[PDB]
Amino acid sequence: GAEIYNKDGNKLDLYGKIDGLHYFSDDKSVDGDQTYMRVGVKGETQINDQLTGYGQWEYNVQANNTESSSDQAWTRLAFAGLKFGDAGSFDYGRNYGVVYDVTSWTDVLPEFGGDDTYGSDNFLQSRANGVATYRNSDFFGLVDGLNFALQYQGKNGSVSGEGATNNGRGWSKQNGDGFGTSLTYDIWDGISAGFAYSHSKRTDEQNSVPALGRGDNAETYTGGLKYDANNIYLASQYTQTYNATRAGSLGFANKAQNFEVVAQYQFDFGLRPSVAYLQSKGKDLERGYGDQDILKYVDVGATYYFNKNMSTYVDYKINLLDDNSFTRNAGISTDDVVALGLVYQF
Amino acid sequence: GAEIYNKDGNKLDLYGKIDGLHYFSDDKSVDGDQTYMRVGVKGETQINDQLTGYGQWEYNVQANNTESSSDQAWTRLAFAGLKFGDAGSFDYGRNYGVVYDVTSWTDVLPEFGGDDTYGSDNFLQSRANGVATYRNSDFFGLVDGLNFALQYQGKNGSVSGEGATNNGRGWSKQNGDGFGTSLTYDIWDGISAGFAYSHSKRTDEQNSVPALGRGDNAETYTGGLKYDANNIYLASQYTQTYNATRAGSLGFANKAQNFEVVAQYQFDFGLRPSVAYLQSKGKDLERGYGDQDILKYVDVGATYYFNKNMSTYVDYKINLLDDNSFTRNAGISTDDVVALGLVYQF
Amino acid sequence: GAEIYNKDGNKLDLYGKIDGLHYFSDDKSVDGDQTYMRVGVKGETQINDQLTGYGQWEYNVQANNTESSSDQAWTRLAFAGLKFGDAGSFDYGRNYGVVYDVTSWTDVLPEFGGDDTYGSDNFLQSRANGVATYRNSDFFGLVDGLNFALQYQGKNGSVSGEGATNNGRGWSKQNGDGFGTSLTYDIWDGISAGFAYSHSKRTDEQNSVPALGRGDNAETYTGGLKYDANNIYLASQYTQTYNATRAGSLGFANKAQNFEVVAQYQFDFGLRPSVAYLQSKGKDLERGYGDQDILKYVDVGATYYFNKNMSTYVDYKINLLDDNSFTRNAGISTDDVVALGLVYQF
Ligand SMILES: CCCCCCCCOCCOCCOCCOCCO
Ligand SMILES: CCCCCCCCOCCOCCOCCOCCO
Ligand SMILES: CCCCCCCCOCCOCCOCCOCCO
Ligand SMILES: CCCCCCCCOCCOCCOCCOCCO
Ligand SMILES: [Li+]
Ligand SMILES: [Li+]
Ligand SMILES: [Li+]
Ligand SMILES: [Li+]
Ligand SMILES: [Li+]
Ligand SMILES: [Li+]
């Protein structure tokens, strides 16, 4: 970030990046120019000796389509909050679900990883609307690395009808009232463990419009491990979900088990190779689908950091999914992808 | 605002807010997450000892819907102008209609009020496209507190056809050529009186597409009073309109009588309780409607200012409208609403 | 540009403008309020004493329509690059096609000139998606004033089908693989000559959907001249195209000859009168059209610069086109336009 303002107890940072990015793939919905930029503002005000006020907004602006194209920009984050010394912080708005406090440990690939085809707004697993989040860092300032979070999310319902809210959306991004919690900590120097749990009510449209997934509650359980020392980064996460993992355009998996593992090495001159394996296995799917792989790929790439403001990267998604009636009907890509990027960050 | 640049006669103020907001209501089109942010710039250049140039842009970015939702950001203001000593200022672009010079005195509620009796792009009552505005403060420097404005707005017509302009829109936001004037007198520190007038040609689509309201011209007459001293804020405004006030989706009221009154108290410790009453009465409505209430509510709330950069509020709109064929057919909300907000300001 | 950050080798410049603009014309698709603003950022990081990293984003935000109107903002530019001593620079993203390195010399009118009705995304003639651009200044430092560029653009295909890419668009803005080069030389102080060439594959939809133009490839050849000294600015460019110039909504011209010439004078007190002639003539058009003028007008205007941050202008497009079957079927405006603008710049 770049501090652009600091007067009379208020500071503002401007941050973002411009990513000149191209994908090469046989999947025509992914192949081609993917250039985009992100811009954001982070503010913080000293209210009193212990109390601070803050705000953050992060905007994504696509630059890979024409000036006559639609829906090219969107808000990723927008929240306001208060932090009281070591007692913790509280913020509300569009923010990350606390499941990401642990699953973010494997979200370190040069380009790929993280969100799936539909994106965020997947209960408390990624960026979400209307989350109230309490966080406590370093256990009231006493235990370095021991962090916890408690989160609540209000219902974001249908566009119209009895299940509507003002900010309605399609079944794949709807949610009822929900809660989540996360706890991360260091076992040893450079070694961390983390746990996250979430439970949300599902909506009537989620239980009637798509063909797959039925249940009143969406739940996730995650465990994660991280090694970050001696220029080596190792991370793994395992998540078991119930009615919460999308099965592409078909609905939700009644049960799913997601596993991700990554190994990276940082050379002092800037080069950072990366190798990872990601899989999401769906269980008990309806319509005779039974058990199906939803995601399965090995990732190999590298980022070269010129400095903190400039980098270049390559990433190879080695797609291990077979083409079958599930991947075709769900619209899940089975093709490999190569990404090439040049990034200026502020 | 936050001044981020001030060099070689030019200065730029970056301003905005991030409002973590939630509405509680039985009306499902209102209920839920309402988080949004505003961001703008105010620029000013000293051309010479007597001449200053200026520009302002204000953007609204909703953050309560998904990253794949449409139409989540829009420009509220965008205008450039010149100010010449005591001779006044002139600006053109998207800016407030001069009726708001007086009705803004009651637009001070913690959350509600504002675009209720006179919504956006509603002739010269609120923000408007293509307004050319001449303003004069302290009557050419000769009468302290005496301000006046003269404004002209060119036609903003239909999307296609004989009534079109490049920037066409639907009947509810159209206008023909029009003008407005306002005069406000700050007679003494904290005591003010104001008058505003507007007259616009109506369009052919406004006299055909909506179910209600017919006439060649839209006219408004406003009177206002404001007391702001001794930690107390009192204000009232009365506006009588002809073919200018919207009757929801039904069209325009042939005549309307709009009234707003507010009383607030500012405690030194930061709390600002507020009580208000707002009403808009439609008269001589066609199709058997006769006289109907378009808007009617008591507002009770409070804002707590932590400092100049952070605040929190609660607002309770006690909706006095009843569900009837007019409110149903016009799409006017008759339910109560509670708003809870946490705002970071810059 | 306004430098809002300069610390540790990283520099950020915020730039843009707010243009309070109104057009007066008998053409209802152009007549009326045209207010808009531009905002951008130019960032540069010193990686080492010879290598620099950079990025630029330019955003256009229309402010002439309502807050409920769609598609009012878009990215004009977004690219990241590396610049290394005399070896040159390389950038990738949304950037100008290298034909603009020479045609930009006539794109200096108060308001008119530049892009036509469809706008940019016209092979390498204007702003384009997915362009990889190599530039070299002063021929590796060996020939002062001799610059060149080499550019590649990957396919930007259809929305769906065999010829699709992720960022698909309509035939008017598609392209296959393309290459461009430019070369400019300052013969003497203030006198330059330039040449540019582009060759792009045309897509199957371009060769099947539109009424006019058929060919495997789009090709352009440009020569230009500029005099910029003694407060005088004269420039001209001639471009010959094959299957590259849009014939309005009808398609592309099998052959076209474009010519633009401009003359301006800068008075020390701020006034800058301007006169220009612009023509685009389609040759070998199918369906009995034969030779037709696609664009033909004289431009007379003036800009008054109060200083570097504030200006006002009047521009008069004297449209020499006649209403015929070609202009009617192609949707080409044949009407005169007068533009009046008041601009604040940062
Ligand atoms: C705020 C204080 C509480 C902090 C959170 C406590 C721990 C949250 O529980 C997380 C549950 O994680 C279980 C991990 O299991 C991974 C796979 O589980 C298989 C399903 O049983
Ligand atoms: C079908 C509805 C009735 C149409 C009658 C048209 C008469 C137009 O009169 C315009 C002038 O009257 C203005 C009256 O304003 C009185 C209130 O002024 C408020 C200022 O504080
Ligand atoms: C002379 C100036 C007097 C100022 C009047 C102050 C008005 C007092 O307002 C009380 C504020 O209390 C806010 C209560 O909001 C409750 C919302 O709760 C929702 C209930 O469902
Ligand atoms: C010394 C003045 C040069 C700039 C004057 C521009 C106006 C004269 O242009 C005449 C028409 O030329 C059309 C453009 O053709 C350029 C051909 O390129 C040849 C480069 O030597
Ligand atoms: Li289930
Ligand atoms: Li595959
Ligand atoms: Li009427
Ligand atoms: Li009610
Ligand atoms: Li051709
Ligand atoms: Li014409």
Numbering used by the authors:
A (entry chain C), B (entry chain A), C (entry chain B): 0 to 345
Which of the paper's sentences describe this entry?
Another important mechanism involves the modification of outer membrane porins which enable the non-selective diffusion of substrates, including both nutrients and antibiotics, into the bacterial cell. Resistance-associated mutations have been described in both major chromosomally-encoded KP porins, OmpK35 and OmpK36. Mutations that mediate pore constriction have been shown to consist of amino acid insertions in extracellular loop 3 (L3) of OmpK36, a motif that conformationally determines the minimal pore radius. A key example is a di-amino acid insertion, Glycine-Aspartate (GD), in the extracellular loop 3 (L3) region of OmpK36 which constricts the pore and restricts entry of carbapenems into the bacterial cell.
To that end we solved the crystal structures of chimeric OmpK36WT with D and TD insertions expressed in E. coli (OmpK36WT+D and OmpK36WT+TD) by X-ray crystallography and compared the minimal pore diameters to those of the previously solved OmpK36WT and OmpK36WT+GD structures. The OmpK36WT+D structure demonstrated the presence of two different L3 conformations, open or closed, both yielded similar minimal pore diameters (2.94 Å (D-open) and 2.95 Å (D-closed)). Notably, OmpK36WT+TD forms a particularly narrow channel with a minimal pore diameter of 1.88 Å. These values represent relative pore reductions of 8% (D) and 41% (TD) compared to OmpK36WT, the latter significantly greater than that imposed by the GD insertion (10%). We found that liposomes with the OmpK36WT+D and OmpK36WT+TD variants had significantly reduced meropenem diffusion compared to OmpK36WT, with rates similar to those observed with OmpK36WT+GD and empty liposomes. All L3 insertions increased the meropenem MIC four-fold from 16mg/L in ompK36WT to 64mg/L (the resistance breakpoint is >8mg/L). However, most isolates (98.8%; 164/166) with the D insertion belonged to a single clade of isolates collected in Thailand between 2016–2018. This acquisition of the D insertion coincided closely with the gain of OXA-232 and NDM-1 carbapenemase genes and an ompK35 truncation, followed by the rapid clonal expansion of this clade. We enumerated lung CFU counts as the outcome measure and found that both KP36WT+D and KP36WT+TD (as with KP36WT+GD previously) were outcompeted by KP36WT. We also found that L3 insertions have no effect on the diffusion of glucose, a key carbon source that is of lower molecular weight than beta-lactam antibiotics.
